Design a protein around this ligand. Structure first.
Ligand SMILES: *[C@@H]1O[C@H](CO)[C@@H](O[C@@H]2O[C@H](CO)[C@@H](O[C@H]3O[C@H](CO)[C@@H](O)[C@H](O)[C@@H]3O)[C@H](O)[C@H]2NC(C)=O)[C@H](O)[C@H]1NC(C)=O
Ligand SMILES: *[C@@H]1O[C@H](CO)[C@@H](O[C@@H]2O[C@H](CO)[C@@H](O[C@H]3O[C@H](CO)[C@@H](O)[C@H](O)[C@@H]3O)[C@H](O)[C@H]2NC(C)=O)[C@H](O)[C@H]1NC(C)=O
Ligand SMILES: *[C@@H]1O[C@H](CO)[C@@H](O[C@@H]2O[C@H](CO)[C@@H](O[C@H]3O[C@H](CO)[C@@H](O)[C@H](O)[C@@H]3O)[C@H](O)[C@H]2NC(C)=O)[C@H](O)[C@H]1NC(C)=O
Ligand SMILES: OC[C@H]1O[C@@H](O[C@H]2[C@@H](O)[C@@H](CO)O[C@@H](O[C@@H]3[C@@H](O)[C@H](O)O[C@H](CO)[C@@H]3O)[C@@H]2O)[C@H](O)[C@@H](O)[C@H]1O
Ligand SMILES: [Ca+2]
Length: 427
């Protein structure tokens, strides 16, 4: 099946996937996805989880890869973020690295843990400051030279300076700084190698708030690194996400991001998009609905039918808005609080259909919108802050439609203002 960014994702038992700050690993034909368990809606350490799949889309939850230990730096009072796991051929060993911290991010350490099987459970080997310097946001890159040299990529010196450092032959420690970008203020790194060249994907530092994520290239990890460029339209702030893991997919990649929900962390969503490298400059393919053939290293973007909101039938006091950020140059504003718009003649073969809602929300806070099909009972769809009144992003909703024509009404029966609705795409 299909990869629908922003949706609620469940494992094969029907439970919400809890694997934020993703790290991916493949053994044989099996994919492993490690992440932070945030089901307690806290930034503090509950577990590093472990999900497996054969196809990157249908995940079964295994045993937790890492659990708290009272009286250590991986207690429930500490922070464990962004786990990454690589396989060490020499020792036939799985080495996990993670950002290890205290609750106020004052410790700035890395943590290491090992296992003999992919899901572990792993054995914590302790935390430390690499080469004596800060480490907060980090990742691990394992090169394809014959020594399979591995590297730590990490925000250091109070997040100001971004560093790349070689690990020793066991992957247990950092031996030597290889590259630094002073004052880059980079976070959430990942590296993909493409045609012998290295591509670093990273965010800047802005707290929980998303920002435009960048790519940099170099022909060696020592640098020099090219000047930053956007992987997505700058104003969308990486389509409201933050980089987590960049997984190679044929001659391209999959961008794996988080949409952090700081007021409800366990409902932070997963934003996965194809990251296309053919132009030589990585670009997010903004696909509301796509599928992947991970063995062939190919992706496929679902085609949908677009319906502009401004062509629907308004009701109440909803009015047209204009903006260069809008499809057709127009959107329906003053929705909710009396204002509605109904999209008529939505065609369908029947059954369940993903629908992407394209909207602008210039508030610093979320909005939401009611969505009723054919007069039926409404569901309430969350509408994150989009980055401005002229900035459109999309969130998905799954609607049951009848064979033939359908109507979809937006904004009825809510006392708050919904976001400005640009268009919808029925997939
Ligand atoms: C995602 O992974 C799921 C687990 O591997 C997988 O579930 C399995 O799905 C098949 C088909 O629904 C079931 O197979 C059969 O179920 C009973 C046996 O209990 C048979 O009598 C049936 O005739 C049928 O052959 C499995 O039971 C089911 N396993 C579990 C643990 O649920 C899903 O199919 C996968 N989903 C997708 C979209 O690929
Ligand atoms: C990787 O190399 C690290 C040295 O760079 C090494 O870590 C350091 O580890 C020791 C203990 O293992 C720490 O010492 C202890 O002392 C502090 C007070 O300073 C107390 O919190 C504790 O008593 C603690 O036991 C060092 O301070 C620490 N150095 C840094 C810069 O953080 C790691 O153990 C090595 N890890 C592996 C897998 O090799
Ligand atoms: C649907 O979107 C609504 C916004 O369009 C949202 O309403 C808002 O909810 C927040 C949090 O509940 C309120 O928050 C805070 O501010 C008030 C003072 O204004 C304080 O009393 C609180 O302590 C808190 O700090 C917002 O005031 C409120 N904003 C508006 C315009 O109504 C709904 O929460 C959303 N509904 C769902 C189910 O998510
Ligand atoms: O009050 C209900 C009404 O809200 C409108 O939303 C506006 C607010 O979100 C406002 C919050 O600051 O921002 C407006 O958008 C502007 C933008 O158009 C203008 O260029 O200045 C700044 C950019 O910095 C801001 O982003 C936004 O329009 C709805 O548009 C409207 O339908 C109605 O719901
Ligand atoms: Ca429009």
């Amino acid at each position: 099946n299909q990869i629908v960014s922003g949706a609620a994702w469940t494992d094969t038992a029907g439970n919400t996937i809890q694997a934020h700050g993703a790290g991916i690993l493949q053994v044989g034909s099996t994919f492993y996805w490690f992440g932070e368990d945030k089901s307690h809606n806290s930034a503090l350490f509950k577990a590093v989880s472990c999900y497996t799949s054969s196809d990157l889309v249908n995940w079964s939850r295994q045993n937790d890869a890492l659990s708290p230990i009272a009286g250590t730096m991986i207690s429930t009072s500490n922070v464990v973020e962004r786990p990454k796991v690589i396989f060490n051929q020499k020792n036939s060993e799985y080495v996990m690295w993670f950002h290890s911290d205290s609750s106020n991010y004052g410790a700035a350490m890395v943590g290491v843990a090992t296992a003999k099987t992919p899901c572990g459970p792993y054995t914590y080997k302790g935390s430390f400051k690499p080469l004596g310097a800060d480490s907060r946001d980090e990742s691990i890159f394992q090169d394809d030279d014959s020594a399979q040299t591995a590297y730590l990529l990490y925000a250091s010196d109070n997040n100001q300076n971004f560093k790349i450092s070689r690990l020793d032959a066991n992957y247990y420690n950092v031996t030597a700084q290889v590259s630094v970008m002073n004052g880059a203020t980079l976070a959430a790194p990942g590296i993909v190698k493409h045609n012998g060249e290295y591509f670093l994907i990273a965010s800047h530092t802005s707290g929980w708030a998303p920002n435009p994520n960048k790519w940099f290239s170099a022909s060696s990890l020592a640098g020099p690194w090219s000047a930053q460029q956007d992987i997505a339209p700058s104003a969308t702030r990486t389509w409201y996400s933050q980089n987590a893991f960049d997984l190679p997919l044929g001659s391209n990649a999959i961008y794996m991001g988080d949409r952090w929900r700081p007021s409800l962390l366990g409902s932070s969503r997963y934003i996965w998009y194809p990251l296309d490298f053919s132009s030589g400059a990585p670009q997010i393919v903004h696909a509301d609905v796509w599928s992947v053939n991970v063995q062939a290293g190919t992706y496929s973007v679902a085609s949908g039918t677009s319906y502009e909101a401004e062509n629907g039938q308004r009701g109440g006091s909803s009015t047209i808005l204009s903006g260069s950020g809008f499809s057709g140059g127009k959107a329906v504003g003053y929705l909710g609080h009396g204002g509605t718009v109904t999209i008529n003649n939505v065609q369908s073969n029947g059954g369940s259909h993903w629908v992407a809602l394209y909207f602008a929300n210039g508030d610093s806070t979320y909005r939401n919108v009611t969505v009723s099909v054919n007069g039926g009972p409404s569901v309430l769809v969350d509408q994150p802050d989009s980055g401005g009144g002229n900035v459109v992003i999309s969130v998905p909703v799954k609607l049951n439609l009848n064979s033939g024509e359908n109507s979809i009404t937006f904004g009825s029966g809510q006392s708050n203002y919904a976001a400005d609705l640009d268009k919808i795409i029925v997939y």
